C-alpha cells in the first residue's frame, strides 16, 4: 500500500521532470549531423544532473559518489528517456518536442548499426509496457542508485536508497495495475536490458576513437577512457 510519504516523493519526482542546437542538415553534413546528436546528448546529461540533484538522498552522498553514480548511469537514463519518446507507428524517436529521427537518421549521425538496432529494439519493448511519468521517474531513480557501479564508496547507503525507490515503485504499480502482479517485475527487468545497452554503447565509444571522431568535452569526460 502506497504511504503518504511515498505518494509525496513520487509526485515531487514527476514535477522535477516536467536552446542553441546545431541544425539538422558531403563530409560537412555528416559532421553537422554527428554534432547535432552530441548536442542533444549534452542537453540530456544536463537534465539528468538537474533531476538527480532533486532525488531524496542523492545530495547526502559524497560528491565523489554522486559523480561515480552519474558517470555510469547517464547512458542508461538517456536510453530510458529515448524509449519514452519512441513513436511506434513511424518507428522513430522525437527529441525536444520536434526533432523526429529513425534508424537511418541515427546511421547518418555516425552511429554504428550494432548500437542503433539494440536502441530501437529496447525502445519498442519499453513502449509495450506503456509506462507513465511516475514509473519512468522511479525507474530512472533506481538506475542512478545502483551500488554495483564502478568506484562507489558507500555501497550500503546507495543500496538502502535504491530500496526506497523500488518499494515506492511496487506500491505505485499495485494501484496503477491492480490486476497484473507481473507489471512491477517486468519494469525492474528492463534495468537488466539497460546494462547490455550500456555495454554496447561502450563498444560504440571505442569505435569513435578508432575512426578519430572526437566527442565534445562533457561526453568525452563521462565516456572516454583517459
Amino acid at each position: 500500500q502506497l504511504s503518504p510519504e511515498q505518494l509525496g516523493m513520487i509526485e515531487k519526482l514527476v514535477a522535477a521532470q516536467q536552446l542553441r542546437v546545431t541544425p539538422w542538415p558531403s563530409r560537412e553534413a555528416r559532421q553537422q549531423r554527428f554534432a547535432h546528436f552530441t548536442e542533444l546528448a549534452i542537453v540530456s546529461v544536463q537534465e539528468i544532473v538537474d533531476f538527480a540533484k532533486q532525488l531524496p538522498g542523492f545530495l547526502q552522498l559524497s560528491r565523489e559518489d554522486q559523480i561515480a553514480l552519474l558517470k555510469t548511469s547517464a547512458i542508461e537514463v538517456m536510453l530510458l528517456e529515448t524509449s519514452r519518446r519512441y513513436n511506434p507507428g513511424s518507428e522513430s524517436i522525437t527529441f525536444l518536442k520536434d526533432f523526429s529521427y529513425n534508424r537511418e537518421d541515427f546511421a547518418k549521425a555516425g552511429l554504428q548499426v550494432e548500437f542503433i538496432n539494440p536502441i530501437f529494439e529496447f525502445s519498442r519493448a519499453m513502449n509495450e509496457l506503456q509506462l507513465n511519468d511516475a514509473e519512468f521517474a522511479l525507474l530512472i531513480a533506481i538506475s542512478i542508485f545502483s551500488a554495483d557501479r564502478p568506484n562507489v564508496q558507500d555501497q550500503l547507503q546507495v543500496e538502502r536508497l535504491q530500496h526506497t525507490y523500488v518499494e515506492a515503485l511496487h506500491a505505485y504499480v499495485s494501484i496503477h495495475h491492480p490486476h497484473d502482479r507481473l507489471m512491477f517485475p517486468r519494469m525492474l527487468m528492463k534495468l537488466v536490458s539497460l546494462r547490455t545497452l550500456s555495454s554496447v554503447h561502450s563498444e560504440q565509444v571505442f569505435a569513435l576513437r578508432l575512426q578519430d571522431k572526437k566527442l565534445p568535452p562533457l561526453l568525452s569526460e563521462i565516456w572516454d577512457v583517459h
Binding site: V45, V49, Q66, I67, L70, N151, P217, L218, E221, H226
Partner: peptide
C-alpha cells in the same frame, strides 16, 4: 579522484 577528472560534471552538480 573522480572529481578532479570530471570538472564539467562537478561544476553542473555545484550550481
Amino acid at each position: 579522484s573522480l572529481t578532479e577528472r570530471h570538472k564539467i560534471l562537478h561544476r553542473l552538480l555545484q550550481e
